[PDB]
Amino acid sequence: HHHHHGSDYDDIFTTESALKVQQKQRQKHFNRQIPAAASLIQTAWRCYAAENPDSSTWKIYIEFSQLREHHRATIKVIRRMQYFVAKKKFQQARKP
Amino acid sequence: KVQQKQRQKHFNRQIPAAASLIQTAWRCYAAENPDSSTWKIYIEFSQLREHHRATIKVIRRMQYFVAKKKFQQARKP
Amino acid sequence: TEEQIAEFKEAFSLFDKDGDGTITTKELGTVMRSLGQNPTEAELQDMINEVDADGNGTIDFPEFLTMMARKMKDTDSEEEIREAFRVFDKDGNGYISAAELRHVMTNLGEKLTDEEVDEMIREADIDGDGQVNYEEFVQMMTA
Amino acid sequence: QLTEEQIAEFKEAFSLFDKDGDGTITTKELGTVMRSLGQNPTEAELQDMINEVDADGNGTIDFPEFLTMMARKMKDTDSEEEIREAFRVFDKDGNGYISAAELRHVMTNLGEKLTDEEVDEMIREADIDGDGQVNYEEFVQMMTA
Ligand SMILES: [Ca+2]
Ligand SMILES: [Ca+2]
Ligand SMILES: [Ca+2]
Numbered sequence: 001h002h003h004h005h006g007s008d009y010d011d012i013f014t015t016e017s018a019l020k021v022q023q024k025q026r027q028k029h030f031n032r033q034i035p036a037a038a039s040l041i042q043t044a045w046r047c048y049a050a051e052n053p054d055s056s057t058w059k060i061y062i063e064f065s066q067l068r069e070h071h072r073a074t075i076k077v078i079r080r081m082q083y084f085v086a087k088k089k090f091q092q093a094r095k096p
Numbered sequence: 097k098v099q100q101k102q103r104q105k106h107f108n109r110q111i112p113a114a115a116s117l118i119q120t121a122w123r124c125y126a127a128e129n130p131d132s133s134t135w136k137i138y139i140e141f142s143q144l145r146e147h148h149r150a151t152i153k154v155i156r157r158m159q160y161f162v163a164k165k166k167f168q169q170a171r172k173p
Numbered sequence: 174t175e176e177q178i179a180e181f182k183e184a185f186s187l188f189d190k191d192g193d194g195t196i197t198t199k200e201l202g203t204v205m206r207s208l209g210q211n212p213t214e215a216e217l218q219d220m221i222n223e224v225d226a227d228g229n230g231t232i233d234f235p236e237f238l239t240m241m242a243r244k245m246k247d248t249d250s251e252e253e254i255r256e257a258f259r260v261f262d263k264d265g266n267g268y269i270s271a272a273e274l275r276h277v278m279t280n281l282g283e284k285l286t287d288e289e290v291d292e293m294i295r296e297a298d299i300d301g302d303g304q305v306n307y308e309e310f311v312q313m314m315t316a
Numbered sequence: 317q318l319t320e321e322q323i324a325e326f327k328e329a330f331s332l333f334d335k336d337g338d339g340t341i342t343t344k345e346l347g348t349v350m351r352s353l354g355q356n357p358t359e360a361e362l363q364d365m366i367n368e369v370d371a372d373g374n375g376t377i378d379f380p381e382f383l384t385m386m387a388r389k390m391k392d393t394d395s396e397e398e399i400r401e402a403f404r405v406f407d408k409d410g411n412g413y414i415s416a417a418e419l420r421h422v423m424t425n426l427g428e429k430l431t432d433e434e435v436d437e438m439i440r441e442a443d444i445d446g447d448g449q450v451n452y453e454e455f456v457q458m459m460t461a
């Protein structure tokens with residue numbers, strides 16, 4: 001439990017494969033960046049596109065596009081029936 | 097020409113009929129156009145849409161902020 | 174055509190939850206009630222009687238196809254629409270008042286929402302000062 | 317930045333995730349909405365999502381925490397430069413341009429995997445081509461306005 005300056009130059013440490021193998025550390029590090037950068041671009045754009053109500057990033061939701069396509073289909077059919085009824089009833093109304 | 101009451105009541109039934117023909121014809125025309133909304137007359141489904149898009153917009157930005165933070169860590173040595 | 178036959182087959186199934194290949198009034202009434210509408214047995218009878226051609230009271234798939242394939246954009250029926258417009262036109266020529274249109278569209282027949290007749294009126298883009306020429310409209314509906 | 321029914325808007329949005337009425341959004345609450353329609357988030361991902369919103373660290377979100385997140389913004393800030401350097405990762409040449417076909421790859425085959433039709437939208441919003449060019453600096457300030 002003491003300490004004083006020893007002043008000895010020669011070294012028998014045999015010390016310096018951590019040089020080009022610490023490379024690996026900074027390749028793993030860049031390898032992490034690729035998924036992260038791709039995700040940032042994707043999530044940013046999907047926030048942009050989402051503000052556009054018709055621009056189809058909404059088609060990625062299958063059930064609801066389904067549901068809309070079924071919704072519109074029912075309406076068109078009904079509306080055409082109502083038309084043909086309104087059509088016949090009008091020429092009834094006109095014939096003396 | 098007393099039989100005008102019959103001829104007028106005859107016309108009286110033509111007015112609702114004409115109005116309906118115009119309305120049913122246009123609603124077929126408006127229907128082929130998917131955004132142009134005669135579809136806003138369907139309340140619960142329009143609400144269902146707004147509820148749908150609301151949920152997405154919220155979700156999509158939680159994912160943004162997560163993607164945001166995860167990128168900042170990926171950049172930091 | 175390929176596209177649309179498949180489309181019609183799917184639309185038919187939307188009204189026929191039964192899978193039996195028939196569409197009854199209660200089937201049709203259910204679809205319209207699900208869409209927030211309140212039709213009556215008469216109106217449903219009328220709708221079906223205009224489609225059902227064999228008089229059995231219900232609609233099959235061939236009968237359904239015939240109505241979907243039915244003409245609408247035709248030489249004969251845009252003249253049927255034009256004279257419906259002529260009913261409301263008193264003067265004699267070809268304009269109906271812009272204010273008058275909103276009145277009859279919103280307050281008569283099937284009625285109509287103000288946003289819907291806004292779409293009509295901006296689909297218009299005609300005004301002497303406030304006047305819509307109706308034959309242009311019928312030819313818009315008929316292209 | 318704040319109006320009348322911007323607030324009523326968010327109050328309803330909060331209630332869409334909270335079927336509880338308790339004023340709380342849990343992972344099961346969030347997981348259900350995503351699983352409702354229509355994707356498959358693991359039991360992970362959800363905590364991350366919530367931990368980025370939850371600021372008092374009790375594992376769930378209340379309405380003020382929900383407000384803070386949408387008070388938060390993308391275009392009004394710098395983070396345009398955060399997106400930019402995410403683009404620089406893929407640009408090898410050093411020029412401000414990334415290949416049109418390369419963008420197709422990274423948007424569809426990496427990360428959250430966008431659809432083909434989605435990147436078409438990106439590419440038509442692009443309107444940039446020498447070979448095909450896509451200066452990602454204009455894409456950045458397109459998203460941020
Ligand atoms: Ca049946
Ligand atoms: Ca039949
Ligand atoms: Ca709750």
Ligand SMILES: [Ca+2]
Pocket residue numbers: 370371372373374375376377378381
């Ligand atoms: Ca909390």
